[PDB]
Amino acid sequence: QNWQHTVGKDVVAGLTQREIDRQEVINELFVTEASHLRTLRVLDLIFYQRMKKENLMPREELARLFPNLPELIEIHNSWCEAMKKLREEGPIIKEISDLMLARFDGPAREELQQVAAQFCSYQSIALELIKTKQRKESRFQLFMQEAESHPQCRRLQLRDLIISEMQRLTKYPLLLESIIKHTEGGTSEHEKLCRARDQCREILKYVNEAVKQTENRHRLEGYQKRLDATALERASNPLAAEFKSLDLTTRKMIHEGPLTWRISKDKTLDLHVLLLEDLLVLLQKQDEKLLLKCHTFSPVLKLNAVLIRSVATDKRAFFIICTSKLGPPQIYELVALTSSDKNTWMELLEEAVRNA
Amino acid sequence: AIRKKLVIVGDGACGKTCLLIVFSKDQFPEVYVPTVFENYVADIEVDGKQVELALWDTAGQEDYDRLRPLSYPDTDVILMCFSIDSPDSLENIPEKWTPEVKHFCPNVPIILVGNKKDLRNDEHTRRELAKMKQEPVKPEEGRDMANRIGAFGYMECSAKTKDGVREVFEMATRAALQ
């Protein structure tokens, strides 16, 4: 239920409204932490321990789906116990900042962010794998329907459940911001909650980056195998010849997306393009192949030798201008799906250019 | 059972979490409004059919571009929200939310939701936005944005009063069945 009408029933009247609110938010943090812990334990018991012991899949697949569940559990369990220690000294909780810093600052921040990153980074890929395997293996499918029918799943699928570490982590700044709002300003307590809130955001930043990088590498690995740079070992413009052995697996990817190329007069050419760190790669989609071909225009631009410019009439187009004096006095006009898109694309390109 | 996955998106503070709470409780939380809504399967009936509608909040994911998409797979309907008291939030519908939902949830119906309609005529609200040379979002702006982004439907509601809450979810459920 609810803190006032719950515990604090006798003690509620001698308190201010701001202190009532404050104890509700705390109470919500604490109760939802226990609830999170319980969810991790359903993952453990209903899915992970059974997958292992019955050999539903190889060890190596399973380790990618639950890299470090026991460690994750103990992160949240330890903090939950410290929470309970606190609740013990009376139902009106007092200073809380130290308990927050003990989870979200310093070494504790380094640990949580690493353990969560490791658990989430690969998750989207491992869930596709699980979806495939359900489609293709009658035993795995039967084990899944059965495990998900357990009452503790609360009618959720594994996947509704496994994303909970990530969702939980996103709740912490909100929870802290809302404890802060009802905390007396000018206190050490207030300053320290603000710190804890700032550190939670940073941790989220780190987990964001881990997912990004892990998904992007797997994706680029996929793109490499579909990469036809065959019309390049003998090109017709030395601008493009050095990229005849181009490995996308060695560069970091910033953005990617479909783009229509006004190459000439009311001719167009549908692309899928990769904004990498050093490079813009224009690729043509042959079936399930990705062609790095010429036209003539080169299909690979070095970002330190370009300029990006907007367009006067077309809220979807943008220009790419090779300032490398030995190449295209012709620009590359590219159209995005929409204005928002063209915007996004512009900003990322201007940024990447600046840093190239 | 018929099981459908609903995910609610839009700018922070534009009432996502509150909206999901009133619908699932059928009561606006009197004493305390919770920050947190956990993934939850609600039962709803529409056009006479029983449906398990799985509800996913994204509050707190707005700043994290590569965390949010983890919510998208297998989605059957999107509830895309803006808040009537924030025309900033409406401009982000075509600007941020639509391209992202079209890209990660292709061919998935979208219902555009104007939250907080109980504020279109709150006085305190109108001024603060008259400050910034703004005023509450008007129904026609909402409906035109729906047609512009190709939404299945446009709805407005207020969580405070509950007005239109049920209807949001009923529409969202009809969309998921088409």
From Swiss-Prot, chain A:
Ubiquitously expressed. It is found in: Cytoplasm; Membrane. Residues 21-210 form the DH domain. GO terms for cellular component: cytoplasm; cytosol; nucleoplasm; plasma membrane. The keyword Cytoplasm applies. Its main location: cytoplasm. Residues 252-354 form the PH domain. Keywords: Coiled coil, Cytoplasm, GTPase activation, Guanine-nucleotide releasing factor, Membrane, Phosphoprotein, Ubl conjugation. Phosphorylated by MAP kinase p38 (MAPK11, MAPK12, MAPK13 and/or MAPK14). The keyword Magnesium does not apply. GO terms for molecular function: G protein-coupled receptor binding; GTPase activator activity; guanyl-nucleotide exchange factor activity. GO terms for biological process: actin cytoskeleton organization; establishment of cell polarity; G protein-coupled receptor signaling pathway; positive regulation of DNA-templated transcription; regulation of cell growth; regulation of small GTPase mediated signal transduction; Rho protein signal transduction; striated muscle contraction. It comes from the Eukaryota. The poly-Pro region is essential for plasma membrane localization upon stimulation. May play a role in the regulation of RhoA GTPase by guanine nucleotide-binding alpha-12 (GNA12) and alpha-13 (GNA13). Acts as guanine nucleotide exchange factor (GEF) for RhoA GTPase and may act as GTPase-activating protein (GAP) for GNA12 and GNA13. Involved in neurotrophin-induced neurite outgrowth. Interacts with GNA12 and GNA13 through the RGS domain. Interacts with RHOA, PLXNB1 and PLXNB2. Interacts with SLC1A6. Interacts (via DH domain) with GCSAM (via C-terminus). Found in a complex with ARHGEF11 and ARHGEF12; binding to ARHGEF11 and ARHGEF12 enhances CDC42 GEF activity of PLEKHG4B, and PLEKHG4B, in turn, inhibits ARHGEF11- and ARHGEF12-mediated RHOA activation. This is Rho guanine nucleotide exchange factor 11.
Swiss-Prot record, chain B:
Changing residue 45 to K: In EDFAOB; somatic mosaic variant; decreased Rho protein signal transduction; decreased substrate adhesion-dependent cell spreading; decreased number of stress fibers assembly; decreased cytoplasmic microtubule organization. Changing residue 32 to F: Abolishes AMPylation by Haemophilus IbpA. Keywords: ADP-ribosylation, Cell cycle, Cell division, Cell membrane, Cell projection, Cytoplasm, Cytoskeleton, Disease variant, Ectodermal dysplasia, Glycoprotein, GTP-binding, Host-virus interaction, Hydrolase, Isopeptide bond, Lipoprotein, Magnesium, Membrane, Methylation, Nucleotide-binding, Nucleus, Phosphoprotein, Prenylation, Proto-oncogene, Ubl conjugation. Regulated by guanine nucleotide exchange factors (GEFs) which promote the exchange of bound GDP for free GTP, GTPase activating proteins (GAPs) which increase the GTP hydrolysis activity and GDP dissociation inhibitors which inhibit the dissociation of the nucleotide from the GTPase. Activated by GEFs such as ARHGEF2, ARHGEF3, ARHGEF28 and BCR. Inhibited by GAPs such as ARHGAP30. Inhibited by GDP dissociation inhibitors such as ARHGDIA. Changing residue 61 to L: Causes constitutive activation. The modification 5-glutamyl serotonin is found at residue 61. It catalyses: GTP + H2O = GDP + phosphate + H(+). The keyword Transmembrane helix does not apply. A motif (Effector region) lies at residues 32-40. It is found in: Cell membrane; Cytoplasm, Cytoskeleton; Cleavage furrow; Cytoplasm, Cell cortex. One of its GO terms (cellular component) is endosome. GO terms for molecular function: G protein activity; GTP binding; GTPase activity; myosin binding; protein kinase binding. The modification (Microbial infection) O-AMP-tyrosine is found at residue 32. GTP binds at residues 10-17, 28-35, 57-61, 115-118, 158-160. It holds the Pfam family Ras. Its cofactor is Mg(2+). (Microbial infection) Substrate for botulinum ADP-ribosyltransferase. (Microbial infection) Cleaved by yopT protease when the cell is infected by some Yersinia pathogens. This removes the lipid attachment, and leads to its displacement from plasma membrane and to subsequent cytoskeleton cleavage. InterPro entries: P-loop_NTPase, Small_GTP-bd, Small_GTPase, Small_GTPase_Rho. Changing residue 69 to S: In EDFAOB; somatic mosaic variant; decreased Rho protein signal transduction; decreased substrate adhesion-dependent cell spreading; decreased stress fibers assembly; decreased cytoplasmic microtubule organization. The modification (Microbial infection) ADP-ribosylasparagine is found at residue 39. This is Transforming protein RhoA. The gene is RHOA.
